[PDB]
Amino acid sequence: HAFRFHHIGVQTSDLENSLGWYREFFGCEQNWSLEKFSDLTRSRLPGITRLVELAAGDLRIHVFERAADATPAPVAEVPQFQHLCLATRSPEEMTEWRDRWLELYESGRYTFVRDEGPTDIVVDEDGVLSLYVLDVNGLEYEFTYLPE
C-alpha cells in the first residue's frame, strides 16, 4: 500500500461531552492530549484550545475544540466528509450497536446536538446490514456487516 489511513479529525463544541461519549460508545482510550499549537495549526483552526487523540482498535480519532461560543449544528447541503463507516463482525453486533446507542442516549449522561435516534437495521439484496447513528455533535456514523 502506498499510504495507510492514520486518523480522522473531529471538531466539536464541547470537548468534555465528546470525550465521554466516544470513550463510552466506541470503547476508546486516550493516548495523549495537546494544548500547545504551532503557527500553522492556529492558522488552520483559529481558536483551537485542546486536541485529544482517541484510539478504538485500528481507528484513531483526533477530537478538538475551537470556539464554543455558540453550539451550531452540522450542515447537510454542503460538501463534507458526510459520515464514517465501521464494519462489524457478526449480524448480532449490529443489534448490539443500536441498543448501546439508545442506552447511552436516554441515560442522560450526554448532550446531543440532534435528537434523531438510530435508524433501523436494513438489509440490501446481497445480505449487507446497514445501521446509522449520530454522535453527540450530530455527525453520522455507519455500522455495517458485509458478508465478505
Ligand X SMILES: N[C@@H](Cc1ccc(O)c(O)c1)C(=O)O
Residues that bind Fe ion (CB under 5 A): 9, 85, 142
Q: What 8-state DSSP symbol labels residue 134?
A: E
Find the shortest distance in angstroms from Cβ 24 to a copy of itself: 13
Rounded CA separation 102/50 (Å): 29
Residues that bind a copy of itself (CB under 8 A): 1-13, 26-27, 38, 40, 44-45, 56-59, 62, 64, 66-67, 72-75, 77-89, 93, 113, 119-120, 122, 124, 130, 132, 137-140, 142-144, 146
Sorted by sequence, the CB contacts under 8 Å of residue 128 that are 6+ apart come out as 144, 145, 146, 147
67 contact choice in a copy of itself, Fe ion, ligand X, none (CB below 5 to 8 Å, kind-dependent): a copy of itself
55 grid coordinates? 484510539
Nearest distance, CB of residue 21 and a copy of itself, angstroms: 13
φ and ψ at residue 62, rounded to 5 degrees:
-105, 95
